[PDB]
Amino acid sequence: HMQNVSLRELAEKLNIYIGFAAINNFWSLSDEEKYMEVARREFNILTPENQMKWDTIHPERDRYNFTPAEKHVEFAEENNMIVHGHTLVWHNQLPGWITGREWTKEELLNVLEDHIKTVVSHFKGRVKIWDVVNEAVSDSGTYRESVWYKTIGPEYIEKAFRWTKEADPDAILIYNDYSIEEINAKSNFVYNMIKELKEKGVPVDGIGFQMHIDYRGLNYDSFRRNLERFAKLGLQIYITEMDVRIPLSGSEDYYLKKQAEICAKIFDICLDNPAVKAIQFWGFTDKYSWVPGFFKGYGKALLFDENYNPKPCYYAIKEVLEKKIE
Incomplete structure (x- = not known):
């Protein structure tokens, strides 16, 4: 009976991780001390929000800057957190050396293999989970027409996972996306995509559900069924970017109570x-x-609110975790 009961302590009892995304340059924020203290007290897994993305880590074709990523990894290791790397292949925020010229398939495949092997080998053994491809599917449930897709075709996704497993055979490799928590056209497209990759022996170890949801919640029965179909493909499941947005106008107490009910329910189903x-x-x-x-x-x-004080959803999730253990 330690005096405080943190989220990470309850997660350790349930053999899961609970954690957060770390803002760029968190160590130099005006309130760095408080930010770092709440993070280390509460969480046991960290994803850098942006500083492992291409624009920061690979800013010119032949230049790599691991300096800010290493600050995130150092903070995690010092505070016994695992690191979730984000993200090796994505369509947005690419640097000008990628977006400002025309590519052929052979040349862009070679660029992607070099980026992935350089970055993944740099952090070999220190990053336990990689988001290898993020958001490859459009909001109609076809392939997203990104630079990667337009130039290479669909084989970019299987090659990214194969190249990542070669560079770190111990990392858990996931596909991560939003608005695929329920059974719908987008998740059905992702499900068949992953089912086909794993039939071909591509090493997709898990699926990341971003969980950017709002005060309307989810169709909980559909999320429960969708988690079951993905798990039965042999996947590990990560809820990777949760937030439960509420309107800024009006009835704050009402929306904070609905946010708490939604977080409680999501945790119930996941646990x-x-x-x-x-x-x-x-x-x-x-x-x-x-x-x-x-x-x-x-x-x-x-x-937590702007002053780092816990909100009703924090107590709600803590109560769910404590009841699951007891």
């Missing part, structure tokens, strides 16, 4: 399926979240 290995939120304090810039009119989507 009932042993394929779910980790639940991370995309940040942890409302002071530092991508939601208000990306979803206009919404925010307050995380576990």
Whole structure:
């Protein structure tokens, strides 16, 4: 009977991880001390929000900068957190050396293999989970027409996973995407995609459900069924970027209560399926979240308020974890 009961302590008892995404340059924020203290007290897995992406780590064709990623990895290792690497292949925020010229298939395959082997071998053994391909599927449930897809065709996805496994055979390799938590056209396309990759022996070890949801919640029965179909492909399941956005106008107490009910229910369903290995939120304090810039009119989507005080959802998830253990 230690005096505080943290999320990470409860996660350790349930053999899962619970954690967060770390903002760029967190160590140099004006409130770095408080941010780092709440993070180390609460969490046992960290994803760098942006500083392992291409624009930061590979800013010119023949230049690599691991300096900010290594700050994230150092903080995680010092505080007994595992690291989730994000992300090796994605369509957005690519540097100008990629977006500003025309590519052929052979040349872009060679670029992608070099990026992936350089980055994954740099952090071999230190990054336990990689998001190898992120968001490859469009919101109609076809392949997203990214630079990678347009130039290479669909084989970019199987090659990215094969190249990542060669460079670190111990990392857990996942495909990560949003709005695939329920059974729908997008998740059906991802399901068949992954089923076909694994039939070909491609090493897709798991699926990441981003869980960027709102105060309307999910169709819980559909999420439960969708988690079961993916687990039965032999996948580990990660909830990778959770946030539960609420409108900024009006009835804050009402929306904080609905946010708590939604987080409680998501945790209940995840803890009932042993394929779910980790639940991370995309940040942890409302002071530092991508939601208000990306979803206009919404925010307050995380576990702690702007002053680092826990919100009703924090107590709600803690209660669920404690009941699951007892």
